[PDB]
Amino acid sequence: SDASVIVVGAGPAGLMLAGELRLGGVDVMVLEQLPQRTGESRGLGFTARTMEVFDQRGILPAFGPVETSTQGHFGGRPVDFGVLEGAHYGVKAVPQSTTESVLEEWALGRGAELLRGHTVRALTDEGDHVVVEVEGPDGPRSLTTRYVVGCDGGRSTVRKAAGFDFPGTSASREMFLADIRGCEITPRPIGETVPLGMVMSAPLGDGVDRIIVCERGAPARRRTGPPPYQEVAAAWQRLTGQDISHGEPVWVSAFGDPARQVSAYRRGRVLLAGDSAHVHLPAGGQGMNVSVQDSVNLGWKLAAVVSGRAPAGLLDTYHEERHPVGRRLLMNTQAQGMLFLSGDEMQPLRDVLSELIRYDEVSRHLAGMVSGLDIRYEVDGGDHPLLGMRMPHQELVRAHGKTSTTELLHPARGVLLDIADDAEVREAATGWSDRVDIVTASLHDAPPQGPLSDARAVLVRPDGYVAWISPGSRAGLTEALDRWFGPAR
Amino acid sequence: SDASVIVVGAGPAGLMLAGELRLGGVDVMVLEQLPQRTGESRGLGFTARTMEVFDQRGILPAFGPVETSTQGHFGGRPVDFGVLEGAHYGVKAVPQSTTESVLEEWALGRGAELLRGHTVRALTDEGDHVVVEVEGPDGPRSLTTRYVVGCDGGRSTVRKAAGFDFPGTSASREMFLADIRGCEITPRPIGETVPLGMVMSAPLGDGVDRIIVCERGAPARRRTGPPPYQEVAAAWQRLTGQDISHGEPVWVSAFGDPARQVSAYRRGRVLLAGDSAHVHLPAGGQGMNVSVQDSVNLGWKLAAVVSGRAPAGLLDTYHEERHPVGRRLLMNTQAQGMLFLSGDEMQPLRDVLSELIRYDEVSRHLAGMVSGLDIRYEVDGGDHPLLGMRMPHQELVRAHGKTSTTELLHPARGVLLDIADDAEVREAATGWSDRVDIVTASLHDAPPQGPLSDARAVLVRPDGYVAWISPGSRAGLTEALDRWFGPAR
Ligand SMILES: Cc1cc2nc3c(=O)[nH]c(=O)nc-3n(C[C@H](O)[C@H](O)[C@H](O)COP(=O)(O)OP(=O)(O)OC[C@H]3O[C@@H](n4cnc5c(N)ncnc54)[C@H](O)[C@@H]3O)c2cc1C
Ligand SMILES: Cc1cc2nc3c(=O)[nH]c(=O)nc-3n(C[C@H](O)[C@H](O)[C@H](O)COP(=O)(O)OP(=O)(O)OC[C@H]3O[C@@H](n4cnc5c(N)ncnc54)[C@H](O)[C@@H]3O)c2cc1C
């Protein structure tokens, strides 16, 4: 068995997972077909929760000094993300290429094995293990592993190989994206409706503008490689009345509006994460974020099962917790795109949306949805609001020195947070001290009526979601720890 | 001068106005080109506020015993209208033909002059008066009046004649509506998306179903008379896979999605009200309601100016108060229609809408918008919530006998409501007792913390909107009465 887990594809999803797996104490092998990273940088910046999952692991400093704004939109419509206590829009500029850069450097630091110029062509789940056919630099090889995770993007080889179900609709439009030099092109962050469809445009920073075009009737086409630049340019004139012949392209590509999502996130011993599981219209910046977050859901869980520390039942929760999120990803993103991408025909409906956004409830809700902060998993049929949601960053007073909720998650074991000083709780948990870090501290600069007010103790999973809280969970701590970390030692 | 005011067109708008004008103590002449009423009954039922404006005048009993539900939609999406204190969806079934029937019988009762088989062909505003060319039963006549009000529907002759501005967009789709017999056709109140577009269908009551069809690519066409039935039928099969050859039609018509609204509601001495001022996609049942309400805004005001009781400045408020409402009518209705009328392509966006509707703020807001109960006019830059909104029905204790806010508006003079017993207020107003009914009473079954709690007095315009409230208006009662009823006597 050449490695415990084989990850195929080394994009955000795969890189994040490879790291998460290593921290989980597991050897891992990433096969990526590309020899050197794309150079395309599709998305710009990342969401609040993606910011937080990076921070959970001490990855943010590698990004260089960065900014975070509260001014963002839901499908063009400005939403102030402040209205939801402790939320914001994200980190502003960062190109995917740099995120991907970062995460590679990380996981390699975490001792993951990355094999480039390695293309997976077929695979078979034999029951106790999985075999994988690979065309690499020196030729075709055959590898054996305990789990394979398809992180190979929108047209996943893995998903087709392992026989997944991929229901949904194929694309109906073709849109263009170009990053151009030289031309003197107006900003259109919200975009702009022109009789023949819509356009958008923004500046990025050193001589380069992004254009997006949507010629209304354009059919969907499968193509070999990007469109030739002059074809996009031709499209831009027929829409704006601007000639961009003279433009020198950096990247040019076509893309579309599909909506498909695997009906099961796991089959036997093969799993999918990122684009490979859910493919959609790129809109409201979600693709990378939600994918990276799939990896953070799965990583620790898989680590546990691989090493015999958890019953395979823990791994099903990856499906149960994420299919829903990916489904909402299709919903969120297609909605957002339809507002963004339509005629003067969609104007009435964004006029009402603008009217509704004005409330607090509404403004929170979409700021919740976009940022990924509204995620609540099923964990316990109890009263408390925080149950099953993410654990917010809160500074803590440890014996000698201050520390943070966020920093205790650096190692990716569970965190049990004794705040009231109850030896009774640190005892019930002793049988798990190998898997959960029992920490006893007090709160520092809490907002006197916040989510941790009147909380004696909290159980935080390795992905930083809350699994159990005192008071106000149906189940005792014993039931809870067994659920997520395995039997008592 | 043959009559004070000439109203052209005797639909909901014109009939309502003719009545409102008579109560205002003014002779009025309605010219309608049709000799006998259409027989078509496009809309079904009416909104809360339309219910209330009818009731303001004692018109509801003529309707026969009727029902009112709280279960309605915003563009297909179920909204419980209850969530907004004292709101609901409307009266359920009533066909326009019966409403039109009712209102005719009313205004004739009110002593309005209705001239049928009379078609207005041209008109000239001469400054001090207006002339009107009319082809009637015995021939062409020329009439003279002080005001003309275009209530002649979507293709208003008046509006074109008097030279109005009618900006907006002409229709882009063609939809079909048919009322059929015999066929066994499924209900589709929310409608239903079929690959080739959308359909809807409901039952109405004695053997007759309504179908609506939207064949996606259908262009807009100007036509002489309705479409032939077999053309709609052909459309229905190409969409549903159902043959309705055998169907016997009662009414068949085509209709579309325009969006236009006169930029000024008044020019010199000519005015517009109803369809003639604002034309749109029929969706969310608004056309009749908002139009009838234009007439109720204008009627009393015009009555005042015609008879020299108010300075012409009162009449401008008809524009200032209603252009905004009509504008929101275009917005409301086109939004609602776009959700209702689109592919599986609009599904994500009604999925978020369904999510937002779940709140209270949102559910109220749309229930407000649809019912027409959210209307607040500019009247005074003051704190109080009720200022400029409609006066809600509240039972009152008069000297001998109980009565209601609603019943005091039967005569269509203003109502000043002394509740605290303050002779100081009944004095300031003495100079207007000719135009305002000074009433002193106490509240009956008020909801102990309602909108009239801690209110000494209220000034209610003839259209039943609140103009001044103690406490909490910038202006004193004197300023207020002069604003709406004219100088002190
Ligand atoms: C126009 C554009 C703009 C976007 N903007 C945003 C944004 O603003 N915010 C956001 O969050 N998302 C955005 N996205 C979406 C985002 O780019 C994707 O979600 C994300 O980059 C893909 O995640 P992934 O790691 O699962 O797959 P990918 O990034 O596609 O990586 C999959 C990898 O698998 C490798 N691979 C595939 N098949 C094999 C195989 N047979 N063997 C070995 N390796 C294989 C590929 O080489 C590839 O490197 C945008 C997308 C587009 C197209
Ligand atoms: C498919 C359909 C369904 C609808 N459903 C609803 C609904 O559910 N709820 C709702 O509120 N609204 C609905 N409406 C809209 C509603 O029907 C219109 O708003 C309303 O009936 C028109 O109001 P009106 O009185 O201003 O004009 P009209 O009702 O059009 O009447 C204008 C009158 O003027 C007369 N006229 C025109 N020109 C002249 C002239 N030259 N000389 C003399 N007379 C003239 C005409 O004969 C006509 O009788 C619907 C409309 C359609 C088409």
mmCIF file of C-alpha atoms in Angstrom, chain A residues 246-459:
data_model
loop_
_atom_site.group_PDB
_atom_site.id
_atom_site.type_symbol
_atom_site.label_atom_id
_atom_site.label_comp_id
_atom_site.label_asym_id
_atom_site.label_seq_id
_atom_site.Cartn_x
_atom_site.Cartn_y
_atom_site.Cartn_z
ATOM 1 C CA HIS A 246 -4.926 46.713 -30.149
ATOM 2 C CA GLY A 247 -5.205 44.894 -26.809
ATOM 3 C CA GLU A 248 -2.471 42.519 -25.691
ATOM 4 C CA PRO A 249 -4.040 39.589 -23.746
ATOM 5 C CA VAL A 250 -2.531 37.886 -20.704
ATOM 6 C CA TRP A 251 -5.247 35.321 -20.211
ATOM 7 C CA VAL A 252 -8.314 34.556 -22.277
ATOM 8 C CA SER A 253 -10.985 31.956 -21.597
ATOM 9 C CA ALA A 254 -14.584 30.926 -22.060
ATOM 10 C CA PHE A 255 -16.858 29.648 -19.300
ATOM 11 C CA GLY A 256 -20.573 28.898 -18.674
ATOM 12 C CA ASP A 257 -23.638 28.311 -16.543
ATOM 13 C CA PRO A 258 -23.878 24.627 -15.603
ATOM 14 C CA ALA A 259 -25.585 23.252 -12.472
ATOM 15 C CA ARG A 260 -24.646 19.728 -11.413
ATOM 16 C CA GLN A 261 -23.660 18.083 -8.171
ATOM 17 C CA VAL A 262 -22.843 14.460 -7.340
ATOM 18 C CA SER A 263 -25.778 12.756 -5.604
ATOM 19 C CA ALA A 264 -23.372 11.027 -3.238
ATOM 20 C CA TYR A 265 -20.128 12.578 -1.897
ATOM 21 C CA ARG A 266 -18.675 9.111 -1.170
ATOM 22 C CA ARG A 267 -18.845 5.668 -2.834
ATOM 23 C CA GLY A 268 -17.190 2.803 -1.090
ATOM 24 C CA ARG A 269 -13.633 4.082 -0.612
ATOM 25 C CA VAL A 270 -13.591 6.988 -3.091
ATOM 26 C CA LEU A 271 -14.527 10.571 -2.240
ATOM 27 C CA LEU A 272 -14.909 13.880 -4.013
ATOM 28 C CA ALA A 273 -14.203 17.390 -2.886
ATOM 29 C CA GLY A 274 -14.269 20.794 -4.619
ATOM 30 C CA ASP A 275 -15.325 21.438 -8.198
ATOM 31 C CA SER A 276 -15.418 17.702 -8.839
ATOM 32 C CA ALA A 277 -18.506 17.382 -6.612
ATOM 33 C CA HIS A 278 -20.401 20.530 -7.559
ATOM 34 C CA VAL A 279 -20.026 22.594 -10.750
ATOM 35 C CA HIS A 280 -21.790 25.884 -11.350
ATOM 36 C CA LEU A 281 -21.780 29.372 -12.846
ATOM 37 C CA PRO A 282 -18.768 31.384 -11.445
ATOM 38 C CA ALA A 283 -20.654 34.189 -9.591
ATOM 39 C CA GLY A 284 -20.451 35.772 -6.130
ATOM 40 C CA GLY A 285 -17.004 34.194 -5.667
ATOM 41 C CA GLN A 286 -17.720 30.808 -4.155
ATOM 42 C CA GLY A 287 -16.073 28.048 -6.115
ATOM 43 C CA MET A 288 -12.690 28.227 -4.384
ATOM 44 C CA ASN A 289 -14.063 29.063 -0.944
ATOM 45 C CA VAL A 290 -16.717 26.341 -0.679
ATOM 46 C CA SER A 291 -14.255 23.787 -2.136
ATOM 47 C CA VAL A 292 -11.428 24.656 0.284
ATOM 48 C CA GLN A 293 -14.046 24.259 3.002
ATOM 49 C CA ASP A 294 -15.038 20.777 1.750
ATOM 50 C CA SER A 295 -11.460 19.776 2.274
ATOM 51 C CA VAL A 296 -11.509 21.161 5.773
ATOM 52 C CA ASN A 297 -14.657 19.215 6.558
ATOM 53 C CA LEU A 298 -13.161 15.961 5.251
ATOM 54 C CA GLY A 299 -9.410 16.002 6.154
ATOM 55 C CA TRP A 300 -9.604 15.492 9.917
ATOM 56 C CA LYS A 301 -12.471 13.028 9.619
ATOM 57 C CA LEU A 302 -10.629 10.882 7.026
ATOM 58 C CA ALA A 303 -7.432 11.069 9.090
ATOM 59 C CA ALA A 304 -9.354 9.573 11.985
ATOM 60 C CA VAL A 305 -10.813 6.638 9.993
ATOM 61 C CA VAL A 306 -7.584 5.787 8.113
ATOM 62 C CA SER A 307 -5.683 5.363 11.400
ATOM 63 C CA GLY A 308 -8.386 3.273 13.129
ATOM 64 C CA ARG A 309 -9.086 6.006 15.659
ATOM 65 C CA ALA A 310 -12.701 6.501 14.488
ATOM 66 C CA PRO A 311 -15.448 4.173 13.282
ATOM 67 C CA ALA A 312 -16.070 4.575 9.529
ATOM 68 C CA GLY A 313 -19.416 6.140 10.541
ATOM 69 C CA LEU A 314 -17.590 9.451 11.160
ATOM 70 C CA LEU A 315 -16.705 9.598 7.470
ATOM 71 C CA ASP A 316 -20.358 9.541 6.333
ATOM 72 C CA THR A 317 -20.811 12.903 8.044
ATOM 73 C CA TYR A 318 -18.635 14.359 5.292
ATOM 74 C CA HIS A 319 -21.484 13.677 2.882
ATOM 75 C CA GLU A 320 -24.264 14.569 5.317
ATOM 76 C CA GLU A 321 -22.663 17.876 6.239
ATOM 77 C CA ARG A 322 -21.515 18.978 2.809
ATOM 78 C CA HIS A 323 -23.971 17.897 0.161
ATOM 79 C CA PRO A 324 -26.366 20.443 1.713
ATOM 80 C CA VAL A 325 -23.699 23.222 1.540
ATOM 81 C CA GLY A 326 -22.805 22.372 -2.049
ATOM 82 C CA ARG A 327 -26.478 22.350 -2.917
ATOM 83 C CA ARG A 328 -26.856 25.818 -1.459
ATOM 84 C CA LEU A 329 -23.771 26.756 -3.446
ATOM 85 C CA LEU A 330 -25.642 25.977 -6.653
ATOM 86 C CA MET A 331 -28.615 27.948 -5.361
ATOM 87 C CA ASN A 332 -26.638 30.945 -4.112
ATOM 88 C CA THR A 333 -24.502 31.181 -7.155
ATOM 89 C CA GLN A 334 -27.110 30.739 -9.889
ATOM 90 C CA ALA A 335 -29.370 33.287 -8.153
ATOM 91 C CA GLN A 336 -26.552 35.793 -7.861
ATOM 92 C CA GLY A 337 -25.621 35.266 -11.507
ATOM 93 C CA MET A 338 -29.142 35.703 -12.815
ATOM 94 C CA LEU A 339 -29.415 39.143 -11.129
ATOM 95 C CA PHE A 340 -25.942 40.074 -12.393
ATOM 96 C CA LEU A 341 -26.248 38.734 -15.898
ATOM 97 C CA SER A 342 -29.659 39.692 -17.224
ATOM 98 C CA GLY A 343 -31.176 42.536 -19.316
ATOM 99 C CA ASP A 344 -33.079 45.612 -18.235
ATOM 100 C CA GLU A 345 -35.470 42.753 -17.731
ATOM 101 C CA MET A 346 -34.032 41.880 -14.327
ATOM 102 C CA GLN A 347 -34.155 45.467 -13.126
ATOM 103 C CA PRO A 348 -37.506 45.383 -11.347
ATOM 104 C CA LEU A 349 -36.390 42.361 -9.418
ATOM 105 C CA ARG A 350 -33.148 43.866 -8.191
ATOM 106 C CA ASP A 351 -35.087 46.966 -7.306
ATOM 107 C CA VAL A 352 -37.135 44.918 -4.850
ATOM 108 C CA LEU A 353 -34.027 43.131 -3.659
ATOM 109 C CA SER A 354 -32.455 46.528 -2.945
ATOM 110 C CA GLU A 355 -35.580 47.354 -0.984
ATOM 111 C CA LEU A 356 -35.379 44.170 1.056
ATOM 112 C CA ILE A 357 -31.587 44.446 1.596
ATOM 113 C CA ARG A 358 -32.331 47.663 3.534
ATOM 114 C CA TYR A 359 -33.589 45.637 6.515
ATOM 115 C CA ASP A 360 -31.327 44.022 9.126
ATOM 116 C CA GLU A 361 -32.684 40.502 8.925
ATOM 117 C CA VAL A 362 -32.252 40.404 5.094
ATOM 118 C CA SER A 363 -28.858 42.156 5.012
ATOM 119 C CA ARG A 364 -27.563 39.686 7.656
ATOM 120 C CA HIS A 365 -28.987 36.645 5.855
ATOM 121 C CA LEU A 366 -27.210 37.269 2.514
ATOM 122 C CA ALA A 367 -24.071 38.419 4.275
ATOM 123 C CA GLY A 368 -24.357 35.083 6.131
ATOM 124 C CA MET A 369 -24.904 33.106 2.910
ATOM 125 C CA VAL A 370 -22.090 34.740 0.907
ATOM 126 C CA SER A 371 -19.437 34.685 3.671
ATOM 127 C CA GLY A 372 -20.158 31.055 4.585
ATOM 128 C CA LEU A 373 -20.656 32.068 8.235
ATOM 129 C CA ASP A 374 -24.260 30.888 8.403
ATOM 130 C CA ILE A 375 -23.278 27.214 8.339
ATOM 131 C CA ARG A 376 -24.921 25.176 11.106
ATOM 132 C CA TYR A 377 -24.479 21.407 11.068
ATOM 133 C CA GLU A 378 -26.721 18.840 12.725
ATOM 134 C CA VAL A 379 -24.942 17.863 15.945
ATOM 135 C CA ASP A 380 -27.538 17.742 18.748
ATOM 136 C CA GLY A 381 -31.254 18.597 19.032
ATOM 137 C CA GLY A 382 -30.588 21.354 21.579
ATOM 138 C CA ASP A 383 -31.603 24.964 22.297
ATOM 139 C CA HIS A 384 -28.231 26.812 22.052
ATOM 140 C CA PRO A 385 -27.635 29.110 18.997
ATOM 141 C CA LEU A 386 -23.934 28.296 18.599
ATOM 142 C CA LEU A 387 -24.453 24.481 18.411
ATOM 143 C CA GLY A 388 -23.169 23.194 15.065
ATOM 144 C CA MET A 389 -21.922 26.572 13.899
ATOM 145 C CA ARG A 390 -18.351 27.830 13.630
ATOM 146 C CA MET A 391 -16.394 28.846 16.748
ATOM 147 C CA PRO A 392 -15.748 32.625 16.538
ATOM 148 C CA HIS A 393 -12.289 34.011 17.265
ATOM 149 C CA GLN A 394 -12.104 34.885 20.972
ATOM 150 C CA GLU A 395 -8.980 35.771 22.924
ATOM 151 C CA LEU A 396 -8.373 33.689 26.068
ATOM 152 C CA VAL A 397 -6.387 33.914 29.327
ATOM 153 C CA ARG A 398 -4.133 30.845 29.713
ATOM 154 C CA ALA A 399 -1.968 30.233 32.831
ATOM 155 C CA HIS A 400 1.133 32.136 31.663
ATOM 156 C CA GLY A 401 0.285 34.083 28.501
ATOM 157 C CA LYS A 402 -2.767 34.981 26.435
ATOM 158 C CA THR A 403 -3.910 32.807 23.497
ATOM 159 C CA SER A 404 -6.852 32.515 21.119
ATOM 160 C CA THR A 405 -9.635 30.117 20.193
ATOM 161 C CA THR A 406 -8.082 30.352 16.723
ATOM 162 C CA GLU A 407 -4.574 29.400 17.858
ATOM 163 C CA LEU A 408 -5.692 26.348 19.825
ATOM 164 C CA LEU A 409 -6.868 24.886 16.517
ATOM 165 C CA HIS A 410 -3.416 25.089 14.892
ATOM 166 C CA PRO A 411 -2.741 21.415 15.660
ATOM 167 C CA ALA A 412 -6.158 20.167 14.374
ATOM 168 C CA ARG A 413 -7.045 18.029 17.357
ATOM 169 C CA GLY A 414 -10.381 18.795 19.083
ATOM 170 C CA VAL A 415 -10.501 21.549 21.704
ATOM 171 C CA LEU A 416 -12.421 21.232 24.976
ATOM 172 C CA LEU A 417 -12.696 24.590 26.593
ATOM 173 C CA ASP A 418 -13.112 24.575 30.355
ATOM 174 C CA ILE A 419 -13.984 28.160 31.306
ATOM 175 C CA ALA A 420 -15.891 27.729 34.586
ATOM 176 C CA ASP A 421 -13.205 25.438 36.075
ATOM 177 C CA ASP A 422 -15.110 22.158 36.436
ATOM 178 C CA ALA A 423 -12.917 19.115 37.109
ATOM 179 C CA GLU A 424 -16.037 17.001 36.425
ATOM 180 C CA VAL A 425 -15.799 17.851 32.717
ATOM 181 C CA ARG A 426 -12.003 17.400 32.424
ATOM 182 C CA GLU A 427 -12.556 13.936 33.897
ATOM 183 C CA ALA A 428 -15.303 12.627 31.629
ATOM 184 C CA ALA A 429 -12.966 13.640 28.815
ATOM 185 C CA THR A 430 -9.741 12.127 30.208
ATOM 186 C CA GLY A 431 -10.356 9.085 27.953
ATOM 187 C CA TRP A 432 -9.943 11.330 24.924
ATOM 188 C CA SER A 433 -7.049 13.538 26.027
ATOM 189 C CA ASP A 434 -5.080 11.777 23.271
ATOM 190 C CA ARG A 435 -7.419 13.295 20.650
ATOM 191 C CA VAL A 436 -8.861 16.453 22.326
ATOM 192 C CA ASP A 437 -6.781 19.240 23.886
ATOM 193 C CA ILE A 438 -8.269 19.941 27.273
ATOM 194 C CA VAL A 439 -7.733 23.624 27.867
ATOM 195 C CA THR A 440 -8.814 25.610 30.873
ATOM 196 C CA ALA A 441 -8.849 29.391 30.440
ATOM 197 C CA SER A 442 -11.007 32.503 30.876
ATOM 198 C CA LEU A 443 -12.344 34.962 28.285
ATOM 199 C CA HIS A 444 -10.375 38.156 27.538
ATOM 200 C CA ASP A 445 -12.112 40.941 25.573
ATOM 201 C CA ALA A 446 -15.537 39.349 25.151
ATOM 202 C CA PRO A 447 -18.542 41.505 24.223
ATOM 203 C CA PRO A 448 -20.317 41.396 27.501
ATOM 204 C CA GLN A 449 -23.402 39.821 25.920
ATOM 205 C CA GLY A 450 -21.844 37.532 23.322
ATOM 206 C CA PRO A 451 -22.229 33.892 22.290
ATOM 207 C CA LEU A 452 -19.966 32.584 25.059
ATOM 208 C CA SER A 453 -21.772 34.408 27.885
ATOM 209 C CA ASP A 454 -23.016 31.871 30.451
ATOM 210 C CA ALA A 455 -21.045 29.005 28.866
ATOM 211 C CA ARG A 456 -19.151 26.658 31.209
ATOM 212 C CA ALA A 457 -17.601 24.467 28.484
ATOM 213 C CA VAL A 458 -17.478 23.902 24.708
ATOM 214 C CA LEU A 459 -16.368 21.023 22.476
#
